[PDB]
Amino acid sequence: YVTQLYYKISRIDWDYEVEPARIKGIHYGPDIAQPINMDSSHHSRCFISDYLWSLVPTAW
Amino acid sequence: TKERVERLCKSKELFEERLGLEIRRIHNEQLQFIFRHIDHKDPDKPYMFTLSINEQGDYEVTSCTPPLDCISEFQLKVRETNNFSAFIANIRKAFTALSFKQS
């Protein structure tokens, strides 16, 4: 159930083949889908999380 | 089916780490949403709320630690819009604002 809630919230589908420092997937949601593909190696945890949450609209 | 179950585990773990959001099942059919990566100076510091579904199928926030001045209105809004994604995203944003104010 958890994995599904994460999709419901984020609308991100991950690429499961790439290594863990490669954040790769597709972001769907209300707007046209866009790819995610970046090396998280030299980024802090908080900045990475802020970046991924920036994809999720808050308008309502 | 081994591939599918494995992928589901992997997805949960990647999401938890990347989003800084852990979702925990507790008593009385409730879920705790634990946000970390909120306070840039203490990335493991947790900000959490607890969610239930009431007898009419409505979202009900049963706890929020630390408290948020806006979360009761966010509950109203999720009941009106049924936009669960926006509900969670707005809560996360509110915790970030709060952490900034807490300093």
Side-chain angles (χ1 to χ4, degrees), chain A residues 4-39:
Chain A
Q4 198 54 40
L5 284 178
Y6 286 122
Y7 177 80
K8 190 180 183 67
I9 295 160
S10 73
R11 305 293 158 150
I12 296 171
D13 279 338
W14 297 124
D15 182 300
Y16 298 112
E17 293 294 338
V18 299
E19 303 94 322
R22 180 167 180 191
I23 299 186
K24 181 179 177 299
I26 300 175
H27 173 242
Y28 297 92
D31 295 89
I32 304 178
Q34 293 174 303
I36 298 167
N37 186 52
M38 56 95 82
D39 176 8

Side-chain angles (χ1 to χ4, degrees), chain A residues 3 6 9 16 45 49 60, chain B residues 8 10 18 21 77 85:
Chain A
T3 293
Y6 286 122
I9 295 160
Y16 298 112
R45 290 186 286 151
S49 294
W60 60 355
Chain B
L8 293 176
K10 195 187 188 168
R18 293 168 176 180
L21 172 59
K77 290 289 300 190
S85 171

Side-chain angles (χ1 to χ4, degrees), chain A residues 1-25 40 44-54 56-60, chain B residues 7-12 14-25 31 33 35 37-40 43-44 59 74 77-78 81 83-90 92-93:
Chain A
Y1 88 94
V2 201
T3 293
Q4 198 54 40
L5 284 178
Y6 286 122
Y7 177 80
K8 190 180 183 67
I9 295 160
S10 73
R11 305 293 158 150
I12 296 171
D13 279 338
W14 297 124
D15 182 300
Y16 298 112
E17 293 294 338
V18 299
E19 303 94 322
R22 180 167 180 191
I23 299 186
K24 181 179 177 299
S40 63
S44 80
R45 290 186 286 151
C46 294
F47 281 71
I48 289 295
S49 294
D50 289 346
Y51 154 67
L52 290 168
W53 285 98
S54 81
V56 183
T58 53
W60 60 355
Chain B
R7 293 311 183 192
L8 293 176
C9 175
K10 195 187 188 168
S11 182
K12 177 276 202 188
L14 290 176
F15 271 121
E16 181 178 311
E17 293 172 337
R18 293 168 176 180
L19 295 182
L21 172 59
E22 182 190 11
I23 304 174
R24 311 195 299 200
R25 293 173 61 181
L31 295 180
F33 289 77
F35 298 92
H37 307 175
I38 296 298
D39 186 337
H40 287 197
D44 294 320
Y59 293 117
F74 293 165
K77 290 289 300 190
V78 76
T81 65
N83 193 338
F84 184 72
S85 171
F87 173 69
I88 300 299
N90 275 288
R92 207 236 169 211
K93 180 173 181 181

